[model samples]
Target: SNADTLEGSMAQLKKGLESGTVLIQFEQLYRKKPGLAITFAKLPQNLDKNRYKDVLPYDTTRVLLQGNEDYINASYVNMEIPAANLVNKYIATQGPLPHTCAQFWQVVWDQKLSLIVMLTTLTERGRTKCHQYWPDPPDVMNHGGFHIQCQSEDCTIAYVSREMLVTNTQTGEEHTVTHLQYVAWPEHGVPDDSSDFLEFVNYVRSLRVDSEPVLVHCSAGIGRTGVLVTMETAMCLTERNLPIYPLDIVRKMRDQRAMMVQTSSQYKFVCEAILRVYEEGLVQ
Candidate 1:
């Protein structure tokens, strides 16, 4: 049945959007959103490390830092689409805090990550959304035992791409990580248009090394992070001719980290974004 394919789902979603039923769909999802009963994020040692007091990674999925501290506002999200025989791994984290920047690099080295997708500016409307965790070109920044240098950076209207070299001062080992930052997104709102974001996410997917997890972060690491994760997962599914259910994806993400696709408007944006991808031939 066409109803069981990505194209079919897109048609249905487009119809729902045109008729305004999608708003109700998002409301239904919010009404039944899951609650976290046990999160280690509030532990005495971990409390101050979180960017937002109310936003905390779930204990079970939280990524453990291998250095002096065992806490960081980050989580491992492993998503599986059985029909596609594919699994996507991600480390969802907050914009690094000034004090927690060291641990941020620790997670990258510890997880052997090769790519990082950043979705927020360092400052937004007089607010510090994320700390500058990387160094400018020609300058190397050291955090704990890690030294990071930006080898190259290319900025565009939609995003910025940087090639970074991370060295372990203690071990004298080196690793290269690519960082993609979306600069066009509005604070606390979805993009006015989806094509640019779709292109950016697809480009991020192209740079991803499937063998290792990719790190994604916004200010709190759930809203923009969730949208990218959800959108990318859908793209992967469609590549395998699988149908996508945005709500299901969001639920599964929340099961790992809370408040994914944070607002109902964001949920609506996910549906619209996917439909745009198909119409524009960005994804097959």
Candidate 2:
């Protein structure tokens, strides 16, 4: 049971925390083959190289649409957690651009994804973090040439939930997708309180049962996005009595998506966030 397994990790977590070994100095732990190693970074003809001012997906690991295999402007990648299958596979992508907004919905409709968790706001502090991909609650919007609408919505201090209908205007395919936006997170930082974050995690967990990889993204789809996925994965390991290792989890994520978690603080926060869920006896 979680009661036992969750309890078991506390001592180890604390030991590493106190001893300064829980997370290796961020630099020492992460050693990727340096330089432009991804073939996709070559800037293909059909790819929207401009959309990616900084973020780039390794060609070998990129997820492309059936017909739009050449467009690299979409900030989407197939992320695999694969550890005891604790969490659903996730598509970690960038906040869709106005032009790629249609493609974003296209990926959802084509992939049949049931959930999308947006970590960054449409605009934060005068900077645009994400495109207003879904039309505001009631009206309709044409995104990437698709018909997208919000069927329903619920909002609170931490998140906004919506039931959406995204139809492929070209193929006539349609998908009803659940959209959950984590309101408390910022582009470069973690949430202010662990409790609110845990509550948000629990809600996402409830919906994660037995589905295709849940789609998660921030502005660049790395910092806040990385932290949330890391926390969810740790909780799963704790529930199964598996040893929790912060460095290892971050390393695994980096394999699928480059430079996730972006900071040592975010890496350490993953340990604290998941541990707080158990420490405070927050919901699963």
Candidate 3:
């Protein structure tokens, strides 16, 4: 019964937004607006399975940048195993679970990240417990900075920068990485203002000077993660005077990876947030 109700509601929303009087408002706001204008209904049902098949597949890597793109050894990391092999990487972890922490640390050990930018909330007790498990962690030993105590649940995000070098130690040739962290977003509903998000973007842009592919992640790596990534991509395209439809960008991300910003709500946020930036000329 609930499923039926949900389906009915979804159908009603779709019709109203696409064909009914609401369409007039949508058209006026999207088509007539001077700034970025777009809409995203639920992704088509036909594309659902294929679109999200690897939402959180472990060891299945998604590469965003090539080694030659920007940094000599920079690459984007997705939910994949080969990502660990890349010089730079990103990983999404499920929260409020011990196994997630275990898996995360394992990746850290395997990847030997020069820097790690964590975008998850850990309760005070959880933080204490984690440090106790690995006191004097390798991250510190490697000078890999960590951003703990993520503020918001829904809107929050973080950024990091790293300076890497090749070194020869007892372990032979190895890469040493450095790190920086930028965090923003609200834990609950959408943000009251865009300053937090904008600051996060500015911080990220500052890191680009280093010419490293920055790693990005959030719990589940879908909602908040997708929003930030899409915005960053859209901003870059805008800078290049390229045309990018917001929904199309999201679809492209899904096509390349899977279930980026998976929920309809997250999709809506991305649309509204990016448009806000475009309207204010903050992105350019």
Winner by TM-score: 1
Report model 1's TM-score to 2 decimal places. 0.92
What TM-score fits each model? 0.92, 0.85, 0.49
Superposition-based RMSD of candidate 2 using all C-alpha atoms, in angstroms:
3.7
lDDT of 1 by residue, 1-284 (tens): 23476777877788888898876766667422355554578888888999999888877788987646688899889898775556888999999999999999988887778899999989987999999999999999999889999999998888899999999998899999989989888666897557788878878888876657889999999998898998998877766667777778887888888888887778788888777666665433
lDDT string, candidate 2, 1-284, tens digits: 23234456677777777777776656686544355266665555535633555576766566676674455433343333445553457888888877777667767877788989998778888978778888886898887668888999998888899999887787877778899988787767778777788888888889884757788888887789888888887777656556566676777777777888887677777777767765554453
lDDT for model 3, please: 0.40
Give a tens-digit lDDT track for model 3, residues 1-284.
12233224334434544454433332333211132111111234312212222333311233212222211111133221122232212443333133233333333334554444444333332332112112222232221122222222232334433343433333445554443333344332343346766676666555542324445554444556566667776565444334445554555445433455655555556555555555456333
Name the candidate, 1 or 3, with the larger lDDT value: 1
C-alpha lDDT of residue 113 in model 1? 88
Cα lDDT, model 1, residue 96: 94
Q: Estimate the overall C-alpha local distance difference test score of candidate 2.
A: 0.73
Decide which is better by TM-score, 2 or 3.
Answer: 2
Q: What local lDDT score does residue 190 receive in model 3, on the 0 to 100 scale?
A: 42
